[PDB]
Design a protein around this ligand. Structure first.
Ligand code: HEM
Ligand code: HEM
Ligand SMILES: Oc1ccc(Cl)cc1Cl
Ligand SMILES: Oc1ccc(Cl)cc1Cl
Lengths: 137, 137
């Protein structure tokens, strides 16, 4: 289930963080505009860039903590406030987050592993609602 | 305290994992004999090798799972048994583990972050005692 999925992802975190972020960026090419330096690069080139590896790992490290602190796939309101108050997320909307979780769930469904994709879909929806309550447009 | 420390360490897992492993290896040079692929290389050389970062991340991730499952800094006997039974740990003794935790506590005290170094010291002592009870020499 959901809790075991967190353990699975953490056990190969750099690989999953990069694979999932790349799936997001290739499913939604417009989202690359939020990173500027990622345009015109293939996946293998991105994976060789310092800020790409460091950044995807930090995103995923924190995403797994938020997932781990949730109850029944509902994140804590304090974790949602943190994500909203981050300077780096000024200019983001909940739509950016919704798209991340659509790609993550699709990636899980296609991997052939025993992920509880339905719990991740609920988690993403519940996170987006929490982000709005915390003030994100 | 202990639980926040786990969150702090997990938030930047690869960076802490590398720095703590290097602190251990440089404090206890003889221990590097267990890691024949890392002999003859400076800290910066090791950090440039993908296999070093991957190895340290996987170890440290499991250490944080064990710490998170502990009650009052006492690890679960099942987690201690897992560590004893791993093939990669054939030939190790509790002494190797004690030295790791000395280096880890020394790293925390020196870092100038508000780690609960006393709790990591207790955790390391209780883990060493649990490894004995699970069959490690
Ligand atoms: C649960 C979901 C997310 C979490 C936990 C998260 C977490 C983080 C963290 C920890 C950082 C700073 C790490 C660093 O030092 O590089 C960061 C930066 C950033 N994140 Fe988020 N993030 C999430 C979702 C998103 C989404 C959906 C977008 C855009 C579609 C996004 C865009 C960015 C950008 C542009 C930066 C800074 C870029 C440079 O630096 N993040 N995020
Ligand atoms: C609580 C502490 C520890 C945990 C959680 C842990 C866990 C692990 C894990 C998950 C691996 C496999 C990582 C990989 O795939 O490369 C591993 C491998 C290994 N560990 Fe441990 N370990 C711990 C302590 C130690 C200590 C103290 C030593 C020796 C001083 C040690 C020696 C080794 C060796 C030699 C390998 C094989 C590495 C290789 O073949 O490249 N471990 N350990
Ligand atoms: O910016 C990111 C880095 C890693 C992951 Cl998994 C998702 C996002 Cl949006
Ligand atoms: O082999 C290791 C990798 C990372 C850390 Cl923190 C400790 C050890 Cl023994």
């Amino acid at each position: 289930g959901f809790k075991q999925d967190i353990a699975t992802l953490r056990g190969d975190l750099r690989t999953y963080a990069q694979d999932i972020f790349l799936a997001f960026l290739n499913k939604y090419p417009d989202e690359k505009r939020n990173f500027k330096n990622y345009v015109g690069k293939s996946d293998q080139e991105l994976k060789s860039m310092a800020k790409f590896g460091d950044h995807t790992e930090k995103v995923f490290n924190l995403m797994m903590e938020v997932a781990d602190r949730a109850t029944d796939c509902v994140p804590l309101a304090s974790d949602a406030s943190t994500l909203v108050q981050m300077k780096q997320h000024s200019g983001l909307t909940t739509g950016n987050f919704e798209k991340l979780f659509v790609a993550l769930v699709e990636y899980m469904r296609a991997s052939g592993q025993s992920f509880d994709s339905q719990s991740w879909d609920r988690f993403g929806k519940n996170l987006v609602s929490a982000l709005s309550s915390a003030g994100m447009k």
